[PDB]
RNA sequence: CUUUAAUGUUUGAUGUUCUAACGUUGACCCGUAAUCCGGGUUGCGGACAGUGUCUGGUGGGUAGUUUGACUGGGGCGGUCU
RNA sequence: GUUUAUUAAAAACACAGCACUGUGCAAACACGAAAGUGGACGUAUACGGUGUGACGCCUGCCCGGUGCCGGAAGGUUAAUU
RNA sequence: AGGACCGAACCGACUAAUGUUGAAAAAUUAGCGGAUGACUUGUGGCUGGGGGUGAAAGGCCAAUCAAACCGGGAGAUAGCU
């Protein structure tokens, strides 16, 4: 659910928190954590390659299974854990042989549910199987681009991929952006839609909330100096120029896609 | 260049001829795996006498290849049971690896790269005919039987 | 480095002479490509970062002789 | 000889298919108790992409520069033979 | 809340929110002659850029100029030959 | 519970006076703002000059910055004093 926080003090007036009562409260599964280092937006050369990244609360990486390499084993969910590394929630599934792994929690998955990934993989929300055995027209998430790569499509919150047609050894997919893409049928994916979809309704209420998520304030170019930004500045607020990126690349319309290698896998762009 | 052919490759030579063939075809096809040898004014006379013995010994290995082609026809059918569903829908698929593994475990060993399956994909239960590549001019047909399990 | 293995060709430097005869320094770069070559004496696929001109050189010289040239000056292939 | 018809060659344009060049930040094994790299076996693209030389277009992102003189101070206005 | 350390603390910057646009992953973009790295061990409810700046009511008309996105009838057009 | 309130340490520097060859190459006194957070601080590390960093003042980068400092070209050049 979504709760609008009462305006007890300025800065909490517009806060709209997202509450998940069934989300587990407590420490995660210790063996499935890895050390995460904040880069701060700096590469190995130490320069800020991408801006507005720095600070924020410390986070521990969760090993989320995207490949589903081991197949044909019944699985049961145990708990849902908050994952700071991604918008979507994660679920801790215990295999019938005693192995615990992390998977992306779909919308229809709650506590005390049973999933089955295998060659048969009866069509239920949460099952994992290749596209050759998935009916055309179902909501599918955690889609792959290559066989065995593991979960490279529709990983965010409330996102899904719809299958429109097969037409041979490939499969045509309607991506969430609105673009038709062709992938080989050997790619493995999961049925159902991904979990919590009310991620829009949270608005963070204040500047400080965005500060501890790792986002630094952004300086608009029109308030900068000509030596710093192409927009620069004059006496008062003056623009007089076409909007461009700080590196002199025209913005608001100029397409920057130049691949010429994956174009054959695309039959229709977004709109 | 002036490469000299040494096999029964497609119609651009007559088992030894100085032709005007671009280096793209000559390399990566003729130099790595038989069928020819570059002629740089030194192998032209060396291989002239070599036509007597290697060509003669090459004319008998092809007879042995036909013998394996005739020997493998002792069954004319190979049965493989694989998981499948209704309306002839197969959960998995069968390729050159499975056919080669089935034949090797049954009779004379065969290479999976020798399987000529252009069209090519096994998706239905029943009878299927697959051709082989025992020679550039000789082909063998074997009927495979996939059964839903 | 962008150096041909068999011919030993290295990038050179030149000028960007425009219509106004302006001189701007530039580099001429060779046509290096990593190609795999088959050898009969050693029965192995050898990979060489060879230039386009070098490939024509090994066509007449042969892969055996050019490998001897590499071993003559201690080049590693 | 002007014209045209038909086998066989040579060179261009389009379209399909194939793999051996090439790519692989796909899977497995080894060096090797190693997310580098290399080698091997497959899978997917595939003569595409990408790179080198030349070439047309764009290109204040960057660089070197120019932006006259007389003048009842300078600028503006006016003039320069 | 931040800012001209050492004459300017502000109506300046930032801000949550909003809108446009680019990006299907070997992503766009950025740092690097390159390898590679950040983006991100993230995957369009995500990331970058731009403008405005809580909230309420709204954001009217104009595509001639410049830029951007598509079109192919037609003309010019380099290297090449 | 709060980027809540009053107010010490702590951080900062809005007003006035003194000081202006000063106790001090920006301080003292009296007042002042924040003071559980976009807070502050200790230790260590990284980003190097047409570059870094910048809640953006062309501010900061060793008492300096519209291109730091040291050495070299170099006895640059000066129709100027």
- The domain of C55 spans 1-77
Contact C28, C12 (CB under 8 A): yes
Asked if C59's CB is within 8 angstroms of B38's CB, the reply is yes
Pull the structure tokens for residue A64.
């989320």
Q: Which nucleotide in the DNA or RNA is closest to residue B119, CA to C1'?
A: D17
Residue B88 touches partner A, C-beta closer than 8 Å: no
Measure the CA–CA gap between A225 and A244, rounded to whole angstroms. Answer: 15
Tell me the chain B residues in contact with residue C60 when contact means C-beta distances shorter than 8 Å. 40
Q: Residue B77 in 3-state DSSP?
A: strand
Angle between helices C63-72 and C52-61 (to 10 degrees): 110
Which residue is associated with the tokens 């060779």?
C30
Method of elucidation: cryo-EM
User: Do A120 and B91 lie within an 8 Å CB cutoff?
Assistant: yes
Q: In terms of Cα–Cα distance, which of B114, B14, B1 is closest to B55? A: B14
Q: Are B27 and B39 in contact (CB under 8 A)?
A: no
Domain region containing B87: 72-147
- A8 CB-side CA count, 13 A: 3
CB contact at 8 A, B31 and B38: yes
Is nucleic acid strand F under 7 Å from A17's C-beta?
no
Distance in angstroms (rounded) separating the CA atoms of residues C52 and C36? 13
| Closest to A119 measured CA to CA, from A110, A108, A106, A128 | A128
DSSP string, B48-67: HHHTTTHHHHHHHHHHHHHH
Classify each residue of A134-154 as buried b or exposed e, where b means 16 or more C-beta atoms within 10 Å of its C-beta: beeebbbbbbbeeeeebbebb
Coil, strand or helix at B106:
helix
Phi-psi region of A207 (alpha: psi -120 to 50; beta: other; left: phi over 0): alpha
- Chain A residues with CB under 8 Å of B122 CB are none
| Prior bond of B120 cis (ω within 30°) | yes
DSSP state of B84: B
Distance CA A193, CA A55 (A): 33
> Of A135, A133, A2, A116, nearest to A70 (Cα)?
A116
Q: Which two tokens stand for residue A224?
A: 């900068």
Structure tokens at B130: 């697959």
Instruction: Tell me how close the Cα of B116 comes to any Cα of chain C, in angstroms.
Output: 26
Residue to substitute from B21, B25, B29, B31, interface C, most C β-carbons within 10 A? B31
Q: DSSP states of A195-251 as a string?
A: S--GGGT---SSHHHHHTTTBPPPPPGGGS-TTT-SS--BSBS---S--B-TTS-B-
Q: Determine if strand E comes within 7 Å of the CB of C27.
A: yes
Distance from CA of C60 to the nearest CA of B (A): 6
- Please tell me the distance from the alpha carbon of residue C61 to that of residue C75, in angstroms, as a whole number: 17
Q: Answer for B61: CB within 7 Å of strand D.
A: no
Q: How far from each other are the two terminal CA atoms of chain A, in whole angstroms?
A: 32
Chain CA centroid to CA A267, Å: 24
C73 phi, psi to nearest 5 deg: -100, 10
Residues A205, A207, A208, A210, Cα dihedral to 10°: 90
Q: Tell me, in Å, the resolution of the deposited structure.
A: 2.4
Rg (chain A; Cα; Å): 22
Alpha-helical (H) ranges within chain A are: 207-211
The spacing between the Cα labelled CA in A250 and the C1' in D66, in angstroms, equals 30
Question: In angstroms, rounded to a whole number, what is the distance separating the alpha carbons of residues B96 and C4?
Answer: 41
Is A99 near chain B, with CB under 8 Å? no
- Which DSSP string do the residues of A55-75 spell out, in sequence order? ------EE-B--S--S-SEEE
The tokens describing A19, both together, are 């509450």
Closest to B130 (Cα-Cα) out of B93, B119, B67, B69: B119
> Number of structural domains, chain C?
1
Instruction: Tell me the C-alpha to C-alpha distance, in Å, between residue B117 and each of A68, A169, B83, B88, B99.
Output: 30, 15, 21, 20, 11
User: Which has the closest alpha carbon to A21: A89, A73, A68, A87?
Assistant: A89
Q: Which residue is nearest to nucleotide D54 (CA to C1')?
A: C28
Compute the C-alpha angle A136/A141/A145, nearest 5°. Answer: 85
Cβ of C43 near strand D (under 7 Å)? The reply is no
Show the 3-state SS of A124-147: CCCCEEEHHHCCCCCEEECECCCC
Distance CA A9, CA C17 (A): 69
Kindly list the structural domains of chain A, giving each domain's residue range(s) and its CATH number in brackets, ordered by start.
1-113 (2.40.50.140), 117-194 (no CATH), 195-271 (4.10.950.10)
Nucleotide nearest to A44 (CA to C1'): E37
What is the rounded CA–CA span in Å between residue A51 and residue C30?
Answer: 37
Tell me C29's DSSP state: -
Beta bridge partners, A117, equal: A73
Closest Cβ opposite residue C62 in set B23, B32, B40 = B40
């Amino acid at each position: 659910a979504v709760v609008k926080c009462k305006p007890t003090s300025p800065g909490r007036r517009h806060v709209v928190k997202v509450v998940n009562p069934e989300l587990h409260k407590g420490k995660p599964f210790a063996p499935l954590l890895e050390k995460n280092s904040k880069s701060g937006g700096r590469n190995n050369n130490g320069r800020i390659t991408t801006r507005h990244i720095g600070g924020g609360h410390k986070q521990a990486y969760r090993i989320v299974d995207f490949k589903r390499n081991k197949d044909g084993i019944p699985a049961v969910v145990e708990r849902l854990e908050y994952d700071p590394n991604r918008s979507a929630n994660i679920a801790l599934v215990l295999y019938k042989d005693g192995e615990r792994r992390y998977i992306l929690a779909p919308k229809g998955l709650k506590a005390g549910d049973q999933i089955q990934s295998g060659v048969d993989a009866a069509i239920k929300p949460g099952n994992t199987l290749p596209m050759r055995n998935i009916p055309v027209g179902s909501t599918v998430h955690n889609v792959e681009m290559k066989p065995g790569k593991g979960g490279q499509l529709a990983r965010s919150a409330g996102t899904y991929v719809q299958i429109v047609a097969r037409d041979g050894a490939y499969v045509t997919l309607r991506l969430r952006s609105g673009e038709m893409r062709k992938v080989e049928a050997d790619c493995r994916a999961t049925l159902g839609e991904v979990g919590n979809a009310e991620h829009m309704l949270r608005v963070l209420g204040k500047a400080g909330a965005a500060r501890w998520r790792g986002v630094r304030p952004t300086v608009r170019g029109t308030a900068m100096n000509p030596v710093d930004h192409p927009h620069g500045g004059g006496e008062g607020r003056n623009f007089g120029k076409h909007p461009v990126t700080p590196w002199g690349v025209q913005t608001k319309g100029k397409k920057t896609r130049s691949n010429k290698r994956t174009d054959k896998f695309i039959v229709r762009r977004r709109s | 260049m002036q490469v000299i052919l040494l096999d029964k490759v497609a119609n651009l030579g007559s088992l030894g001829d100085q032709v005007n063939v671009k280096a793209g075809y000559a390399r990566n096809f003729l130099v790595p795996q038989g069928k020819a040898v570059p002629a740089t004014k030194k192998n032209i006379e060396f291989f002239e006498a070599r036509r007597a013995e290697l060509e003669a010994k090459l004319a008998e290995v092809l007879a042995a290849a036909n013998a394996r082609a005739e020997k493998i026809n002792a069954l004319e059918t190979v049965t493989i049971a694989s998981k499948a569903g209704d309306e002839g829908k197969l959960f998995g698929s069968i390729g050159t690896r499975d056919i080669a593994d089935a034949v090797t475990a049954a009779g004379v060993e065969v290479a999976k790269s020798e399987v000529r399956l252009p069209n090519g994909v096994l998706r239905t239960t029943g009878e299927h005919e697959v051709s082989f590549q025992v020679h550039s001019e000789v082909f063998a047909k074997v009927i495979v039987n996939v059964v839903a399990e | 480095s962008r150096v041909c293995q068999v011919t030993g060709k290295r990038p050179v430097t030149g000028n960007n002479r425009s219509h106004a005869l302006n001189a701007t320094k530039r580099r001429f770069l060779p046509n290096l490509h990593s190609h795999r070559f088959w050898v009969e004496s050693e029965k192995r696929f050898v990979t060489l970062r060879v230039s386009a001109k070098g490939m024509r050189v090994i066509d007449k010289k042969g892969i055996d002789t050019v490998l001897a040239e590499l071993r003559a000056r201690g080049e590693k292939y």
